[PDB]
Amino acid sequence: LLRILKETEFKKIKVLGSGAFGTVYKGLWIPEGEKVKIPVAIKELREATSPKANKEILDEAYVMASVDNPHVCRLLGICLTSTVQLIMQLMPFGCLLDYVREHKDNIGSQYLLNWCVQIAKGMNYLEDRRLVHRDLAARNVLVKTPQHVKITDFGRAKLLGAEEKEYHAEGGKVPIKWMALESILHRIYTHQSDVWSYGVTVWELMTFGSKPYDGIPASEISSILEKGERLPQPPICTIDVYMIMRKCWMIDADSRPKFRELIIEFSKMARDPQRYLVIQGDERMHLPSPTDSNFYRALMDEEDMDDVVDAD
Ligand SMILES: CC(C)c1cnc(N2CC(CS(C)(=O)=O)C2)c2cnc(Nc3ccnc(N4CC[C@@H](O)[C@@](C)(F)C4)n3)cc12
């Protein structure tokens, strides 16, 4: 399932991102001289020689290769040299968090609630595969087209044994502001801690990209959760939507909704989106259609491919 490829059959055209994760490139698969040039995303390990960093990207690659679903990102391939490179699908509109921030004045209720369904469907798929993501957040949801998003970033994902309910984590830097209380306090992750993370993710979307608990330092979060403080109701949210969010943040993990329930409830809501999200000018808001998206690709591909001509 892990397809080990030759690095030399890949051309890096653009740096799409660089950070803790390393570097992500827009790249071309060119296996036969000039005949086929297929766009991929390439994530490259920076700390080539780090035993820990090598463990993290090889665990990521292992989990990401095991997943076949329309709302999750699969690993196409891996290159092993002095470093590791994950070959992944190019997602032309990048991550959903940057997207909702950049396109807020054109995002309608129908797109917001569809994303909620799509992320729940994907999380439900991962649950059925016995995967606890442990890092669900709007930054870890990528946009193939405005109408089609996929969960990614399996760097923290853990595969549970059959009928095993929880994963007990060691020490490490953890995304406190997206974690269930039991995860913060006791390092316990389940499908239900993923449901807490999903609640924060919906909250990120409904606020067009607000940072959770803005200003409050991570160290104060377990304390505010214990006092019953949760993320505020986003202005566009009717109480029915904010109630699903609040249910995802109940102290008792088993009282939190199930991804399969969240699919049924967000789906219901997406059939009458303007009843459940109140957005000004919702009726006259437009985003690139799937065909307009294929165009945008072709436009950007053209200018990128022209920059490879006035270079190399
Ligand atoms: C930084 C990542 C999330 C990223 C950013 N921007 C992209 N763009 C494509 C567009 C320019 S274009 C194509 O129109 O010329 C801006 C990204 C495109 N595709 C991806 N692909 C994937 C596919 C699957 N998984 C990941 N990951 C998961 C692991 C993380 O560490 C990650 C940062 F590598 C993203 N990335 C990412 C784009």
From Swiss-Prot:
Changing E7K: Found in a lung cancer sample. Changing R275A: Reduced phosphorylation. Changing R3A: Abolishes phosphorylation. Changing G17D: Found in a lung cancer sample. Changing I4A: Abolishes phosphorylation. The modification N6-(2-hydroxyisobutyryl)lysine is found at K43. Changing G17S: Found in a lung cancer sample; somatic mutation; strongly increased kinase activity; constitutively activated kinase with higher levels of basal autophosphorylation; more sensitive to gefitinib than wild-type. There is a cross-link at K14, K35, K52, K55, K165, K227, K258, K268 (Glycyl lysine isopeptide (Lys-Gly) (interchain with G-Cter in ubiquitin)). Phosphorylated on Tyr residues in response to EGF. Dephosphorylation by PTPRJ prevents endocytosis and stabilizes the receptor at the plasma membrane. Dephosphorylated by PTPN1 and PTPN2. Monoubiquitinated and polyubiquitinated upon EGF stimulation; which does not affect tyrosine kinase activity or signaling capacity but may play a role in lysosomal targeting. Polyubiquitin linkage is mainly through 'Lys-63', but linkage through 'Lys-48', 'Lys-11' and 'Lys-29' also occurs. Deubiquitination by OTUD7B prevents degradation. Ubiquitinated by RNF115 and RNF126. Ubiquitinated by ZNRF1 or CBL at different lysines in response to EGF stimulation; leading to recruitment of the ESCRT machinery and subsequent degradation in the lysosomes. ATP binds at L16, G17, S18, G19, A20, F21, G22, T23, V24, K43, M88, Q89, D153. The modification Phosphoserine is found at S289, S293. Changing G17A: Found in a lung cancer sample. Ubiquitously expressed. Isoform 2 is also expressed in ovarian cancers. Residues 10-277 form the Protein kinase domain. It is found in: Cell membrane; Endoplasmic reticulum membrane; Golgi apparatus membrane; Nucleus membrane. The active site is at D135. Changing G17C: Found in a lung cancer sample. Binding of the ligand triggers homo- and/or heterodimerization of the receptor triggering its autophosphorylation. Heterodimer with ERBB2. Forms a complex with CCDC88A/GIV (via SH2-like regions) and GNAI3 which leads to enhanced EGFR signaling and triggering of cell migration; binding to CCDC88A requires autophosphorylation of the EGFR C-terminal region, and ligand stimulation is required for recruitment of GNAI3 to the complex. Interacts with ERRFI1; inhibits dimerization of the kinase domain and autophosphorylation. Part of a complex with ERBB2 and either PIK3C2A or PIK3C2B. It is linked to Lung cancer: A common malignancy affecting tissues of the lung. The most common form of lung cancer is non-small cell lung cancer (NSCLC) that can be divided into 3 major histologic subtypes: squamous cell carcinoma, adenocarcinoma, and large cell lung cancer. NSCLC is often diagnosed at an advanced stage and has a poor prognosis. Neonatal nephrocutaneous inflammatory syndrome: An autosomal recessive disorder characterized by intrauterine growth retardation, premature birth, fragile skin, recurrent skin infections and sepsis, failure to thrive, nephrocalcinosis, and nephromegaly with tubular dysfunction. Some patients have chronic diarrhea, and necrotizing enterocolitis. Belongs to the protein kinase superfamily. Tyr protein kinase family. EGF receptor subfamily. This is Epidermal growth factor receptor. It comes from Homo sapiens. The lineage of its organism: Eukaryota, Metazoa, Chordata, Craniata, Vertebrata. The gene is EGFR. The chain holds residues 703 to 1014 of 1210 of the full protein.
